[PDB]
Amino acid sequence: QVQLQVSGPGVVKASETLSLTCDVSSASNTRDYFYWSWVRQSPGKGLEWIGGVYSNSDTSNKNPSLESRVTISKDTSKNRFFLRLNSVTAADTAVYYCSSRAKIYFAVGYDSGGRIDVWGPGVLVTVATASTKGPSVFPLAPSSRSTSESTAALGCLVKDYFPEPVTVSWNSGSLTSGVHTFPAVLQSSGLYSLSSVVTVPSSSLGTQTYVCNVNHKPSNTKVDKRVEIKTC
Amino acid sequence: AVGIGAVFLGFLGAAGSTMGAASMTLTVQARNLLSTVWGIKQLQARVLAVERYLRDQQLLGIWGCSGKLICCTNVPWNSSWSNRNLSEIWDNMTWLQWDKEISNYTQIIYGLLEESQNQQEKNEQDLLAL
Amino acid sequence: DQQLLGIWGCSGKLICCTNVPWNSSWSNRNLSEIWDNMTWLQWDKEISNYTQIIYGLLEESQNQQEKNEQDLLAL
Amino acid sequence: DIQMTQSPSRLSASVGDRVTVTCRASQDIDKDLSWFQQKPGKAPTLLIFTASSLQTGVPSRFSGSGSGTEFTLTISSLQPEDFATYFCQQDYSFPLTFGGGTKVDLKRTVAAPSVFIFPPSEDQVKSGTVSVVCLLNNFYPREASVKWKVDGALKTGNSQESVTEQDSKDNTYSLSSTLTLSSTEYQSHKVYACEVTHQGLSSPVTKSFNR
Amino acid sequence: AENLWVTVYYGVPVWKDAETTLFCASDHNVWATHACVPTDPNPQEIHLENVTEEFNMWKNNMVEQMHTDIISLWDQSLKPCVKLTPLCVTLQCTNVTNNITDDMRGELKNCSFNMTTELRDKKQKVYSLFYRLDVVQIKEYRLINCNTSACTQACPKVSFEPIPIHYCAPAGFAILKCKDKKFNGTGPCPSVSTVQCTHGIKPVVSTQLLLNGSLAEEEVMIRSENITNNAKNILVQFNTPVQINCTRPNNNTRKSIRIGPGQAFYATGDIIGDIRQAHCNVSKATWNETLGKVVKQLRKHFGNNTIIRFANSSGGDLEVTTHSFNCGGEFFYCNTSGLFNSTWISNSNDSITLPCRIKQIINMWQRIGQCMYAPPIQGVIRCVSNITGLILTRDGGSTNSTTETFRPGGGDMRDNWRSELYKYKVVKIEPLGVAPTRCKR
Ligand SMILES: *[C@@H]1O[C@H](CO)[C@@H](O[C@@H]2O[C@H](CO)[C@@H](O[C@@H]3O[C@H](CO)[C@@H](O)[C@H](O[C@H]4O[C@H](CO)[C@@H](O)[C@H](O)[C@@H]4O[C@H]4O[C@H](CO)[C@@H](O)[C@H](O)[C@@H]4O)[C@@H]3O)[C@H](O)[C@H]2NC(C)=O)[C@H](O)[C@H]1NC(C)=O
Ligand SMILES: *[C@@H]1O[C@H](CO)[C@@H](O[C@@H]2O[C@H](CO)[C@@H](O)[C@H](O)[C@H]2NC(C)=O)[C@H](O)[C@H]1NC(C)=O
Ligand SMILES: *[C@@H]1O[C@H](CO)[C@@H](O[C@@H]2O[C@H](CO)[C@@H](O)[C@H](O)[C@H]2NC(C)=O)[C@H](O)[C@H]1NC(C)=O
Ligand SMILES: *[C@@H]1O[C@H](CO)[C@@H](O[C@@H]2O[C@H](CO)[C@@H](O)[C@H](O)[C@H]2NC(C)=O)[C@H](O)[C@H]1NC(C)=O
Ligand SMILES: *[C@@H]1O[C@H](CO)[C@@H](O[C@@H]2O[C@H](CO)[C@@H](O)[C@H](O)[C@H]2NC(C)=O)[C@H](O)[C@H]1NC(C)=O
Ligand SMILES: *[C@@H]1O[C@H](CO)[C@@H](O[C@@H]2O[C@H](CO)[C@@H](O)[C@H](O)[C@H]2NC(C)=O)[C@H](O)[C@H]1NC(C)=O
Ligand SMILES: *[C@@H]1O[C@H](CO)[C@@H](O[C@@H]2O[C@H](CO)[C@@H](O)[C@H](O)[C@H]2NC(C)=O)[C@H](O)[C@H]1NC(C)=O
Ligand SMILES: *[C@@H]1O[C@H](CO)[C@@H](O[C@@H]2O[C@H](CO)[C@@H](O)[C@H](O)[C@H]2NC(C)=O)[C@H](O)[C@H]1NC(C)=O
Ligand SMILES: *[C@@H]1O[C@H](CO)[C@@H](O[C@@H]2O[C@H](CO)[C@@H](O)[C@H](O)[C@H]2NC(C)=O)[C@H](O)[C@H]1NC(C)=O
Ligand SMILES: *[C@@H]1O[C@H](CO)[C@@H](O[C@@H]2O[C@H](CO)[C@@H](O)[C@H](O)[C@H]2NC(C)=O)[C@H](O)[C@H]1NC(C)=O
Ligand SMILES: *[C@@H]1O[C@H](CO)[C@@H](O)[C@H](O)[C@H]1NC(C)=O
Ligand SMILES: *[C@@H]1O[C@H](CO)[C@@H](O)[C@H](O)[C@H]1NC(C)=O
Ligand SMILES: *[C@@H]1O[C@H](CO)[C@@H](O)[C@H](O)[C@H]1NC(C)=O
Ligand SMILES: *[C@@H]1O[C@H](CO)[C@@H](O)[C@H](O)[C@H]1NC(C)=O
Ligand SMILES: *[C@@H]1O[C@H](CO)[C@@H](O)[C@H](O)[C@H]1NC(C)=O
Ligand SMILES: *[C@@H]1O[C@H](CO)[C@@H](O)[C@H](O)[C@H]1NC(C)=O
């Protein structure tokens, strides 16, 4: 069975050259030829075929939309292949997958009716424009009037940080039930923002200490923020 | 299929595979079983290959299985040769292991097969006599 | 020669029919002009170019036929 | 380029139900189209090739039919492991065009969201930009509508929705609608409200605050 | 109830260990390339996935077959040319003392002798230059081989250049290759592959040093039939070759003497210019690094805290006591004393020069009574080779000893072919099988 592993820079600046390298570890030594291809999936969108190349011939085939920006090369001696994208824009942020396609034959002409069509684990590529920075953490306090209900909701807004990821815990990890940390969304400022909320018994307000612990390795920023009601 | 390669199955590729999976790749094995000091030994190499292929073909023919890859026969399988179940052998054993298992019963099976082929020929003659 | 015949399923048959259709570009002559107006030597000279491709076609056709027969007998 | 259209875009079915998906091309492409399955955070895996042949190791419950322009993928017995996004890829001519994807989710009962709104703190106001967060907690089905009303008037833009995946335990969703504004624009209005409409709410639920 | 019946399967992927005759494939020479099958320009390799096979390089029939084939080829090449029966006569010799170096005093002997003329009733007084290893005293000298057997002059137009040879089995037989790295030459090989036949193996003759061979992939490889036994030779395969530059710079002159009807004897008339010893240069730093790798791999099989010393050959024939090889027709015997002279304890442009002696009377294989005379090669001769391996012998010593001494070895050419055929075995296909099935005819 053939195995594919892809690698490359996780962050590429705009208008630069995005280089991805996918290596193959197989062949069964029978002098087969595979078809090595690249496919991307943008966040919230479907799959799209960038291009591909044969494993023995120089015949390489490209998407007409991306024909002028994509260059696909291969090294058969070292069993790997490289994709280069030029004039990268913000729309190119996507999960890239490298693939090998083959057809099983008994002999040259005796098709057996089988393929492999394998896909690599893939890597996320983000087209950023800002630099590293730690988050600002703002408590999302329950309104004083919302004590009439039996369940209270509180949270923490983690805003203006770059790059991903940020890990959010509650009460140093002791509070896990009811915790929802939403995915990060890139803001018009060019930096990430998210919220981490939790639902708790409203009777526990005033007896429980609720602290959100935010961790951001890239700026080495750890912030512990209390969240309490607003007494008037 | 536009973008697709050709993985040609190789000679003795399914040697390590189970018997059930290895029985699907008999063709790649069977298709190429025939094809001063250097020339003299090349000659006897050719002769050895030819006679081996001819003996194999004769053994196939005398069992009534000429020109076939899988040949269903009329002789029953004696349980004394192997007490293993069908699902055991066809999904948890390779052809090499089977050959090692029944290496000491091949001659009896071959004799029974050729005797049954002779009996079948006699029965066909009797049927054609009517 | 014997194995070449056998890989087409024509073992032991002097005349053996096959499922490969006769493409027109190989020869546009009719049956009457072939079997009653010329010999085998002229025929072989004519189809010398299309011999290997025809052999491969027959070979793959027999391969498909034996695969289908095995699949049918499996049930 | 040959265009693939897949239907239905999203569907809900329980374990053991029969599921059908239709993939249609823009022109005749013979039987050259493969059906592929991809799990969350995983690479795609081959289910069917040439629209009728089952890949080795795939359960026989999966099947494919159709030909020409219209092809169909059928799951006879849905199982917990089958809940993954399915897509249809053509290979009759270049370029290789993929399908739109078919996300399938586990079925459950209706659960109404718990709706909350969080006014920004003063510290957030002094930063020059503010974010008002409206939280929908533990709801199903995924279909929900959140609208932003400022001083009683519906207004569009400046609001972003972020949704967690279907919870492994209770099979519900939670959503955050964040309205991000400048401090000047925030102080240019008084009342901010998020209105939520969902299958489990007989009437819309409006959570609002005055600055 | 089961209703089990025999089913015959043809083309079953089963093989069996067997011995067969492997013909030659390749692209005037002693090794007959003209009489060999043309090799496939695209060799067809197959990975035997899910397969494990047991190999044993020390009992491989391929090595014996190659040895027999090489001996037969050498015998064939030496038949159709002159046999120097009349060369055995009393030789009146003098020391060569004109334009010679201090290290070549007495090496060359200028010997005058009577020789048979084309006419049976005439004699001619001729002279020739003979190396000291070729002449033995009865001022009177005779060829060393005279009291052993007559010598056959090597065919002059026949070249001794090694040519790659592919040993390929007949149909119904395949060759199994062990591609697993760090292989030990005996036991299971997890990574097995099947091939029609092997790569190009040059029949290079050499003692104490494997030249122009195949190198290891990962690291230096130590192999032995029984490492604990001191009577078993150790084969070392290098990962990086060591360049060795051998040269005889004497400007030898070749002259022909009509020793009969249509029979010519080729003699060394005179040396143009200065006379100096042939030698071989080996890079000092590269050799030291290679020996460091060798000692690193050897300490694994003999302990980590044991002294490892490389010393000179114990003794015996000139073939085994010195690095004996053939380069460009000439036969060199090099004193490998500066190479295997060092000790190892666990913790520039200069090069090692090994003097070499040229010999004309050659006892090629380990045989008595079959000797060959090499005609002189005209002009300066120089060549460069790749030391890619080593043959060693461990001294007896004792268990109580805390040091292991390894000396250079060789002599037997079976090891030379073993070092190339270590990753190869031959098997015969068994396509017929019988299985139980619920099918009935
Ligand atoms: C390991 O491999 C390396 C690389 O292949 C080997 O080194 C090569 O060795 C060869 C053979 O010695 C050598 O080729 C000779 O080089 C000389 C310089 O070019 C030539 O003198 C010589 O040609 C003569 O000999 C041929 C037969 O050997 C004849 O076909 C040819 O016509 C020439 O013979 C004429 O001249 C001689 C001398 O005057 C005379 O006696 C004859 O009658 C005739 O008139 C060869 O081409 C390569 O140059 C070497 N290459 C390098 C890089 O060094 C090395 O030997 C191998 N090691 C081992 C141990 O095998
Ligand atoms: C060698 O073994 C592996 C597993 O040990 C075989 O792969 C199996 O193939 C079967 C049939 O296709 C599958 O049902 C199994 O799930 C596979 N196992 C794994 C771990 O993936 C493999 O086929 C064997 N080699 C050959 C050449 O057949
Ligand atoms: C080897 O000996 C021969 C003969 O003994 C030498 O040839 C003689 O060379 C001298 C010049 O030095 C001539 O005057 C003689 O006429 C030669 N004699 C014959 C019989 O040819 C030869 O030079 C000697 N070679 C060496 C290297 O010492
Ligand atoms: C070649 O043969 C001649 C003739 O036999 C040798 O000359 C004889 O030498 C012996 C002593 O060895 C004398 O007793 C004879 O009188 C000599 N005869 C003649 C005619 O000269 C000559 O020595 C031989 N040469 C060599 C190099 O051995
Ligand atoms: C000695 O070894 C060197 C290094 O391995 C050989 O050089 C290689 O030659 C091969 C020829 O097949 C090339 O494919 C490699 O690229 C070469 N490698 C380097 C590093 O140059 C050299 O040919 C060897 N010489 C002899 C006579 O065997
Ligand atoms: C490798 O050689 C050693 C040394 O000869 C063998 O071990 C010896 O076996 C003999 C058998 O009669 C004993 O008498 C010796 O006392 C043993 N010596 C030692 C040092 O163990 C060993 O068996 C050989 N290995 C193999 C695999 O044959
Ligand atoms: C082997 O090395 C020796 C020195 O260790 C070389 O001898 C030198 O040869 C060059 C020829 O280029 C002369 O210019 C020097 O004068 C020599 N020096 C000495 C000290 O003898 C020898 O040439 C080398 N041989 C080879 C074949 O590389
Ligand atoms: C053996 O000979 C080769 C070839 O002459 C030597 O390599 C040369 O080394 C010189 C001196 O450093 C360089 O100028 C040349 O460019 C080299 N040529 C090649 C082809 O590599 C090599 O050093 C010699 N080795 C020994 C041990 O004497
Ligand atoms: C290995 O080295 C030893 C020690 O140098 C060599 O022994 C020498 O042999 C010569 C005669 O060939 C004697 O004249 C020396 O006196 C010896 N040396 C010593 C120090 O006693 C031995 O010959 C070398 N081995 C080889 C194969 O060359
Ligand atoms: C191989 O070379 C070594 C090193 O030169 C030789 O050992 C030398 O032998 C001579 C004899 O004349 C002694 O004078 C030296 O002292 C010895 N050197 C050392 C370092 O011990 C050895 O004899 C040579 N081998 C042969 C067979 O001649
Ligand atoms: C020739 O030289 C060697 C070595 O120097 C010497 O032993 C021999 O006696 C010499 N022979 C003569 C001068 O005849
Ligand atoms: C030949 O002579 C040499 C040297 O005189 C001697 O060592 C050898 O044993 C002799 N061989 C025979 C077979 O007489
Ligand atoms: C490799 O071969 C040697 C030869 O004696 C043997 O002792 C050793 O156990 C083998 N190693 C393995 C891992 O089988
Ligand atoms: C050897 O001698 C010949 C004849 O004098 C000459 O032409 C040639 O150049 C010499 N070779 C060398 C290497 O000195
Ligand atoms: C030898 O020393 C090395 C140091 O790297 C160590 O890893 C290895 O285990 C040692 N071997 C033995 C046999 O003690
Ligand atoms: C051997 O090495 C020793 C170092 O102890 C040195 O004295 C001696 O000269 C060396 N001999 C040779 C022949 O290299």
Residue numbers in the entry:
A (entry chain I): 1 to 35, 35A, 35B, 36 to 52, 52A, 53 to 82, 82A, 82B, ...
B (entry chain D): 512 to 546, 569 to 663
C (entry chain B): 589 to 663
D (entry chain J): 1 to 211
E (entry chain C): 31 to 57, 66 to 141, 150 to 184, 189 to 309, 312 to 321, 321A, 322 to 398, 410 to 503
From the paper:
The best of the FP-directed antibodies, DFPH-a.01, elicited in macaques, has 59% neutralization breadth on a cross-clade 208-strain panel. We characterized two paratope-distal light chain (LC) mutations, S10R and S59P, which together increased breadth to 63%.
To investigate the structural basis for the observed improvements in affinity and stability of DFPH-a.01_10R59P-LC, we purified its antigen-binding fragment, generated complexes with BG505 DS-SOSIP Env trimers, and collected single particle cryo-EM data on a Titian Krios microscope (ThermoFisher Scientific, Waltham, MA, USA). We had previously determined the structure of another lineage member (DFPH-a.15, which had 46 amino acid mutations versus DFPH-a.01) and observed highly similar recognition. In terms of the two mutations, both were distal from the paratope, with 10R-LC being 23.4 Å distal and 59P-LC being 9.1 Å distal. The S10R-LC mutation was located at the interface between the variable domains and the constant domains, at the elbow of the Fab. Comparison with TRNM-b.01 revealed residue 10 to influence the elbow angle, with a 15-degree difference between DFPH-a.01_10R59P-LC and TRNM-b.01. Analysis of the structural context for the S59P mutation revealed its ability to provide isosteric positioning of T56 CDR-L2 contact with Env trimers. The double mutant DFPH-a.01_10R59P-LC had a KD of 113 pM, roughly twice the binding affinity of wild type, which had a KD of 209 pM, suggesting higher affinity as the basis for its increased neutralization breadth. Interestingly, single mutations enhanced stability only marginally (0.3 °C and 1.0 °C), whereas the double mutant had a melting temperature that was 2.5 °C higher. We found that in addition to incremental potency improvements, these mutations improved the IC50 neutralization breadth from 59% to 63%. These paratope-distal substitutions improved DFPH-a.01 by allosterically rigidifying the Fab elbow (DFPH-a.01_S10R-LC) and increasing CDR loop flexibility (DFPH-a.01_S59P-LC).
